[PDB]
Amino acid sequence: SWAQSRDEQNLLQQKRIWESPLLLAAKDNDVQALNKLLKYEDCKVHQRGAMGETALHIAALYDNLEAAMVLMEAAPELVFEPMTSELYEGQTALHIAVVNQNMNLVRALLARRASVSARATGTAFRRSPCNLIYFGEHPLSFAACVNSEEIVRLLIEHGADIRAQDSLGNTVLHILILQPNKTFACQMYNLLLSYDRHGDHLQPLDLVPNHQGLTPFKLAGVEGNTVMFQHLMQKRKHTQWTYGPLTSTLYDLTEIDSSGDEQSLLELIITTKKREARQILDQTPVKELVSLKWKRYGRPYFCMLGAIYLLYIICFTMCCIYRPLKPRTNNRTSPRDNTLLQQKLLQEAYMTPKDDIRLVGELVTVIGAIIILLVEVPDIFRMGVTRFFGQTILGGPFHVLIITYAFMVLVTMVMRLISASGEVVPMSFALVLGWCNVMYFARGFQMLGPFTIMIQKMIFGDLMRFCWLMAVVILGFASAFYIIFQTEDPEELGHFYDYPMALFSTFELFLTIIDGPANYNVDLPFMYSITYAAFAIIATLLMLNLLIAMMGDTHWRVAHERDELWRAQIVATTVMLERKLPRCLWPRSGICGREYGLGDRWFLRVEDRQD
Amino acid sequence: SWAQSRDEQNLLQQKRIWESPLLLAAKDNDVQALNKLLKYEDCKVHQRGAMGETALHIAALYDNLEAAMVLMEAAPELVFEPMTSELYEGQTALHIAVVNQNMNLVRALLARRASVSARATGTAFRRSPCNLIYFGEHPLSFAACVNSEEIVRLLIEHGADIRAQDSLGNTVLHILILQPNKTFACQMYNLLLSYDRHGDHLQPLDLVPNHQGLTPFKLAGVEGNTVMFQHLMQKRKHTQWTYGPLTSTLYDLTEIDSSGDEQSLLELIITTKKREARQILDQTPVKELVSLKWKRYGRPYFCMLGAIYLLYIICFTMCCIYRPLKPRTNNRTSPRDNTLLQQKLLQEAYMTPKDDIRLVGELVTVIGAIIILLVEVPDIFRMGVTRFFGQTILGGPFHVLIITYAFMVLVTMVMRLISASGEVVPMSFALVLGWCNVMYFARGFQMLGPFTIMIQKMIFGDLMRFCWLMAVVILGFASAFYIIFQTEDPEELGHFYDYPMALFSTFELFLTIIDGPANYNVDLPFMYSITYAAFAIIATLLMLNLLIAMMGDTHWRVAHERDELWRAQIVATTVMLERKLPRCLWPRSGICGREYGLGDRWFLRVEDRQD
Ligand SMILES: Cc1cccc([C@H]2CC[C@@H](N3CCN(c4cncc(Br)c4)CC3)CC2)c1
Ligand SMILES: Cc1cccc([C@H]2CC[C@@H](N3CCN(c4cncc(Br)c4)CC3)CC2)c1
Ligand SMILES: Cc1cccc([C@H]2CC[C@@H](N3CCN(c4cncc(Br)c4)CC3)CC2)c1
Numbered sequence A, B: 001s002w003a004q005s006r007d008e009q010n011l012l013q014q015k016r017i018w019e020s021p022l023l024l025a026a027k028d029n030d031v032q033a034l035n036k037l038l039k040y041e042d043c044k045v046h047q048r049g050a051m052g053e054t055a056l057h058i059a060a061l062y063d064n065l066e067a068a069m070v071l072m073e074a075a076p077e078l079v080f081e082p083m084t085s086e087l088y089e090g091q092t093a094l095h096i097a098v099v100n101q102n103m104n105l106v107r108a109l110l111a112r113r114a115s116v117s118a119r120a121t122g123t124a125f126r127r128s129p130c131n132l133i134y135f136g137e138h139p140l141s142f143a144a145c146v147n148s149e150e151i152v153r154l155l156i157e158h159g160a161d162i163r164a165q166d167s168l169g170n171t172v173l174h175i176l177i178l179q180p181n182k183t184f185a186c187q188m189y190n191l192l193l194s195y196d197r198h199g200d201h202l203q204p205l206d207l208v209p210n211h212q213g214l215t216p217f218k219l220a221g222v223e224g225n226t227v228m229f230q231h232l233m234q235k236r237k238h239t240q241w242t243y244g245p246l247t248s249t250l251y252d253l254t255e256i257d258s259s260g261d262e263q264s265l266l267e268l269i270i271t272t273k274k275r276e277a278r279q280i281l282d283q284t285p286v287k288e289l290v291s292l293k294w295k296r297y298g299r300p301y302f303c304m305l306g307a308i309y310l311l312y313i314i315c316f317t318m319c320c321i322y323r324p325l326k327p328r329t330n331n332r333t334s335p336r337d338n339t340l341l342q343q344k345l346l347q348e349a350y351m352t353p354k355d356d357i358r359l360v361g362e363l364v365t366v367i368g369a370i371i372i373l374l375v376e377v378p379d380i381f382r383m384g385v386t387r388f389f390g391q392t393i394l395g396g397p398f399h400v401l402i403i404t405y406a407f408m409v410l411v412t413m414v415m416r417l418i419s420a421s422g423e424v425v426p427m428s429f430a431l432v433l434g435w436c437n438v439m440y441f442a443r444g445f446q447m448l449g450p451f452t453i454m455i456q457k458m459i460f461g462d463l464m465r466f467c468w469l470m471a472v473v474i475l476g477f478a479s480a481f482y483i484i485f486q487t488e489d490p491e492e493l494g495h496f497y498d499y500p501m502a503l504f505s506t507f508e509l510f511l512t513i514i515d516g517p518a519n520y521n522v523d524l525p526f527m528y529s530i531t532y533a534a535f536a537i538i539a540t541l542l543m544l545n546l547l548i549a550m551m552g553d554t555h556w557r558v559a560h561e562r563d564e565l566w567r568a569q570i571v572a573t574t575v576m577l578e579r580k581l582p583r584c585l586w587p588r589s590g591i592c593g594r595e596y597g598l599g600d601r602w603f604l605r606v607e608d609r610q611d
């Protein structure tokens, strides 16, 4: 109902044209009608539209210079008045002729002293998918987006300012990144830098960030303008020597690596969501850098990190399988055919030196659980329960399990001091979520790990869209079996003797695991064989065999998507590694300056062949 | 850290340019600065670079003839001095102007008596992937690689030598094979043979091998230059008579078949590893030859070899299934429910004439085991244990099993004289590795054998990349089951009563083989049904059904790779067959000479249609 208020007013805007004789004569070139419209009497001028127009705005909007020339002769005061109502707020007639890419009227409006620095800050211009467009907030910002180059120089010549910024802090050089006509706007970016006369006081007009705090180079990395990124690299690199077909160049490397602050360049590529921008990882100075940093020093620190965790789980699961049990004392099997149990484990009996060996491993796993908590969820000293909602989707899928690995190991610290009955249940999740987590180390380790990016893409969606429709069908038949054996003895075919297990066992026949019941000794009810054969056609010949073919398109449709997603997680491992690991170890890559006459910013180089 | 020492020096090279006034004036055309740089005072010249340059080298490198002309006027002695430091070792300024493909300076350097035969033998030129290039070691070798043809004649005219060789023994005709711009260098190869005036004493400049011992024809077969191979065939063939559309030509056949020595041509194609060169098997004179030699005399010797081995295993397995057992004597089942056994086989009781029939077959299989050893691993008289490491990867995958087939048959020779207890275990591998080996004879035998090249490509990788992630998941749940039935009676659901079998049985449920446990008579523990249903979703509906679709791309992505790999193993069977089989049988193919006026080298012919 939000966008309804736009077009409700927008037809209503046209009503005032049909309502007024001035505005309807303004939409057409009614210069004969406009001649007598203000000469025969002193009719008023400032009658606004439904959303606050002048006829000068309308003559601008419906591309009519001629009546606007008569409107200049009638009343040359309308130019100062902008529009006023909440969508087109502050926009004046200088903007619209620029949007119309010429009207030979910037020759006329500026001659009538067109105010340039007005800020059309209405919400029909803010960067949002509710608008279909984005153009900035200044007339110099507009004409660049439509590239009317001759108009731009005349717009500059009467005192345009390059350094204008918006509420978002962006200047005109941020805007040319955001246009969707990529290469047609690239030569526009070269033109404005030619009109950079000087640095104002500190930076030479390209080094300025926004209110988000990003230079326009880094913003191109955010949106992933692949063509524009290659054009803005050309002043960063520095060719060194050429040898026939040999080319030896020195890339810059000061904007594209972690220098302290959280906004280098590479954190931004992982933390964004746009799939288009992840293809920045195949341009020249970055792909060589990340492959160098992963190979030298990057890979073996990850694996030797992984070797510790593998011994952690072994020291957990051996401490799991040894456990202070006891024979079943003081409690018979007095519930007959209900308790088939023998242990009811001990309470405080560690009086054995072999238990000290277990007392090692229990102490081993509990301290590392605190380490896992205080390295990835540090925001626990605040003690915020609603903070956990900002930790679920903020973080990867493997950034969820290992957190939940900790809580279960916290419970076996909690429970064994309290010594209550329920003990194997938190230990159960503690044991199976542990071993499943080792695929987090199967990210790299060889090229045998873009298998794991495939099973990630399949478990979300393409089995969850099957897990519903299994429960669609199977909740029918299981109750249908539950009725159809309701009159039956349990001691033969105890599959469906009660609904909580009868719901389970029909799920055991959907995946063909259990054999499918038959006695063949006494005669089963004569409606079973009908409805059960109905079950096997739908389940294990239609439904499940569809699913293998269902993967059949979602395995080559995403063929070269898994490989580009495999280059995602290595950078996501590399940047995560450098930020966690300190100095005097992991020497920061590239080659330093100050020794060779270059400067303080570091460098790397790549030698190749033109061919 | 190895290539770091390159670029550490390489920026440091540029520092001496920034450090010295001569070298910085040398990089630019500072002829006014160079005019006073040595006229105002007698400044020294031999100030080398960080890696040993002159300004003449730099003027050559940064394409500046003009200062080099002034450098000739200042001091015409720098040409004799080469570079000196370990990477560009021995390279002089004559090389670099050649790499720059002209400078109008070979007109000047040779006028100043440019030394031609210098050998730039630094390790920035040795054939290695550490270098990005390869160009040989002589100025005549360089200009051919960049094809500056006019320069080459002027380079020859002042006394270039064609017959130069390197440390690798290669001459300039080996070099043109190795360039990656294939057809652009082909006409270069025709030019140098035109400047073959005479044979030196013995060979006419094309018959010379390298230090590896290969003529440049055979080297083209090694690297697989498919276009260049077709150009070097044109002097080997000999057209005979044409009949309208009929064409009758006589190919050469003396360089491409086993003539004694181990380096004919066809051993080289199998023993190399480059996938590009195996596509030499579809040019004209080879594909017809190998198909002729496989069809006539080749195929039936392989199958009649295979028929012997099939009767060998039958005579093994019948000797396997008859075995000197005995009833269980002197040893009761005193470990109760631990020994369910009845035999504890005999020791030295062969007193039966039916055993002589078995004494045939035991003697049959043991002698052939020595035959298998002394035909494929002859290096056992040396008695080298570490030699076995040079026999594993050196040899095919079927060149491993049949070796390990021998050791197990050696153990049943060893064990039955010693008569210890463990007897069925080496016999077990002896029986199953035997029958699996018969796929080695399913290489050819019909076209129903590029199935076996497919299962080879799948068992390495595409199931081994699944065999890890099975053990990832299943080591969790099996311990998780082991906990969750730790308090449970074993006599009902004895699946998980101890961990070494509980590890096995959960592996029995991952491949859906066993039924999946249920009693349905007494009530199982109330956390089992939760975690077990969690198991079947992950295992037998997500993991295993992914794998069928995982083959789904790796069965048509390698579609016309298996057929080209099927032509590999037939040549690998043919060449293996000829080398093992003697003369006075397997008449060596082609048609002999000396009877028709041709000569001593043999020949074959192919008749076809131009169409
Ligand atoms: C994205 C991605 C990528 C790769 C792998 C994963 C894992 C996703 C969740 C993980 N669970 C293991 C055990 N679970 C469970 C344990 N007890 C009870 C219940 Br009910 C469920 C459910 C699944 C398996 C693989 C995820
Ligand atoms: C390249 C290629 C191409 C085609 C065929 C093969 C064979 C590869 C190995 C061979 N083994 C047979 C028995 N094995 C075994 C025997 N006892 C215990 C264990 Br554990 C393992 C493992 C596999 C099967 C086919 C290989
Ligand atoms: C049962 C099962 C199991 C696993 C997989 C499959 C199918 C999956 C993929 C399918 N190709 C996909 C589209 N095609 C194609 C490929 N390149 C270019 C063009 Br044009 C078309 C040919 C067939 C073959 C088998 C089926």
Ligand SMILES: [Ca+2]
Pocket (backbone or CB within 6 Å): A512, B512
């Ligand atoms: Ca089955």
Ligand SMILES: [Ca+2]
Pocket (backbone or CB within 6 Å): A513, A514, A515, B513, B514, B515
């Ligand atoms: Ca079954």
